Paper text:
Class A plexins (PlxnAs) act as semaphorin receptors and control diverse aspects of nervous system development and plasticity, ranging from axon guidance and neuron migration to synaptic organization. Plexins are large type 1 transmembrane proteins comprising typically ten domains in their extracellular segment, a single membrane spanning region that is predicted to be helical and a conserved, cytoplasmic region that contains a GTPase-activating protein (GAP) domain with a Rho GTPase-binding domain insert. All our PlxnA ectodomain structures show autoinhibitory, intermolecular “head-to-stalk” (domain 1 to domain 4-5) interactions, which are confirmed by biophysical assays, live cell fluorescence microscopy, and cell-based and neuronal growth cone collapse assays. This work reveals a 2-fold role of the PlxnA ectodomains: imposing a pre-signaling autoinhibitory separation for the cytoplasmic domains via intermolecular head-to-stalk interactions and supporting dimerization-based PlxnA activation upon ligand binding.
We determined crystal structures of the full extracellular segments of mouse PlxnA1, PlxnA2, and PlxnA4 from eight crystal forms providing a total of 13 independent structures that range in maximum resolution from 4 to 10 Å. In five out of 13 full extracellular structures all ten domains are resolved whereas in the other eight structures some of the C-terminal domains were not modeled due to fragmentary or absent electron density. Some flexibility in the stalk is evident on comparison of the 13 different structures and contributes to the ring diameter ranging from 84 Å to 99 Å. The membrane proximal domain IPT6 (domain 10) is positioned perpendicular to the ring formed by domains 1 to 9, and the IPT6 C terminus points away from the plane of the ring. This out-of-the-ring orientation of IPT6 is observed in all five PlxnA ectodomain structures for which the electron density is sufficiently well ordered to allow IPT6 to be resolved. All our PlxnA full ectodomain crystal structures have an intermolecular plexin–plexin interface in common. This interface is formed by blades 1–3 of the sema domain of one plexin molecule and the outer side of domains 4-5 (PSI2-IPT2) from the ring of a second plexin. Superposition of the crystal structure for a full-length PlxnA extracellular segment onto our previously reported Sema6Aecto–PlxnA21-4 complex (Janssen et al., 2010) brings the two IPT6 domains into close proximity. The distances between the two PlxnA ectodomain C-termini in these modeled complexes range from 10 Å to 59 Å for the five PlxnA crystal structures that have all ten domains resolved.
Numbering used by the authors:
A (entry chain A): 692 to 801
B (entry chain A): 37 to 581
The structure:
Amino acid sequence: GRVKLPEDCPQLLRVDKILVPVEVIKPITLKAKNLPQPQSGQRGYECILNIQGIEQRVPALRFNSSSVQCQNTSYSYEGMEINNLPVELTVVWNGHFNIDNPAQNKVYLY
Amino acid sequence: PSFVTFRGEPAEGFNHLVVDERTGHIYLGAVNRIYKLSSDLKVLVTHQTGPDEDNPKCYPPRIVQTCNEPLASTNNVNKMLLIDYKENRLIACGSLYQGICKLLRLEDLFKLGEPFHKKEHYLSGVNESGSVFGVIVSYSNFDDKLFIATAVDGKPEYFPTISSRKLTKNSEADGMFAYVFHDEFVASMIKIPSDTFTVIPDFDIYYVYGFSSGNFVYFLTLQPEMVSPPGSTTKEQVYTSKLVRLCKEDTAFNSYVEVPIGCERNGVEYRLLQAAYLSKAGAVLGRTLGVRPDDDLLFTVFSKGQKRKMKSLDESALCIFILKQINDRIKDRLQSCYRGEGTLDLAWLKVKDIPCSSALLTIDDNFCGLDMNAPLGVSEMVRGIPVFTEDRDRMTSVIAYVYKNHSLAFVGTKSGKLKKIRVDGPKGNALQYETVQVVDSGPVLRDMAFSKDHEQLYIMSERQLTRVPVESCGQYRSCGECLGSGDPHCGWCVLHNTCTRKERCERSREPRRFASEMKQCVRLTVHPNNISVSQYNVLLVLETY
């Protein structure tokens, strides 16, 4: 569990842009590094999308120290105002613990 | 004196217990909890496996996919527990996940991994504790695996009752619980056929005990009414207790064998296995038994009749099987099939009876099984040698060990008592003592293990674990009394003037230092036996032998 070096820290690595169509059931695979294995008394991972219209909480599975995936779900925003809406996403585990997002990767709902 | 114990730390529940050979630390499986305890039964660490929102009906549990059925916080029962020394961890398989298994680190109980994603990662819907068993066998790398049997609950498509699975080094690895050899045609697993389910609705295999011997793996199982008892249509279910075996080496699963097992006492039938324990005889039992030092033995416990596996009868009997004898029965059976005589006769597996094919073969104990005359059953039920029978209070569990060549047997009771039995068919006698370390009102569980040092015997109850010492000879004050009691553990440590076991007496090995029989005591005589009150300071001579 100890982190002496900055390279080793828990963070989400970027992949080709995450495209998400509205009203489509799709999984969102993620890559990352040094994801912790939840210890006793600690719950699993969730994907939180910060959409002003609706914030979605989808639970996810941590396959290994470097990969995650939100489960099949569909997303939407109300308005039909703009085609491409980038959304900040926060990966959390054990409820509150937010994993660091240096790149600040976002999900594009189109 | 009081016995050291661990109360249900969760006062709430308890299910399985195991001891680490090196450390002596005791790991205890329970509902919603897995505990690590010291030899003394002090609480080392508590793990929360428990209450998870879930539903038994749902296939791939909520995490993988959405389930229409409503969820409720439910209890996760520890179905199984197995120590993986090589991996330096503990496999603690639960339920309520569709039976997902967990890996806890040996020292701290840190969760190394718990594979949920694939179908193999799910063992069984079954909520019941102890209905599952298995063995972990390991070798150096590029040689290895886990054999596990579990009940299906009528899930035949989802899970295999018996399987040969993979245990990768990395707990994170996806590969875990994958079948050793998977082929489109045949996989290292045995499923229950759908046809058999339709015929008998409820059929299910419950695995009580399991152990590795030589180079095989045996399981004591309970099954349903299939040609026993005869019945045209479904109605009542009665069970038949049988022995199962596999070659460790058979990826194909061709080696499967299944013999019904039981024993009878004066015209009374004891068909249902409560528990079993593989062990050694030691010089005493082995000699009269006619065995080699290495040869194994299997102590077992059976209830009377075929009825009510859920709640069996009080009448119970402790029987015995010599592995050589069972091996013979199996070899005898195989050499017969190879004769081409009769059918395979395994009702649940093969509905339509296929015939045995004759062939030229050298039939040995090594025989792993062949493509033709494939998995087969057995006609002649193997009878066991009876030892002790309790009518009033049902035996629940058993263990045994070698002490100074004498074979001591331990038997749990429905009452919460342990019996210390010297088996003396090969010698000559019966039950030496009974103890209530445990729990005066209500019973003991099959997981009953002796410590590594073999000083104590941890006895598990639904509520508590109790460290019952294997002898309490100290109660006896004199050589006459000590040897008088007869409980075989006790001897008179002459110089110490105390009553205890051979191990306890320092220098007992030396001559006349320790007394086994009353004759050895002590005999004393005084020459002036009678002396008058008037006399004083008279010389007396003492003769002692």
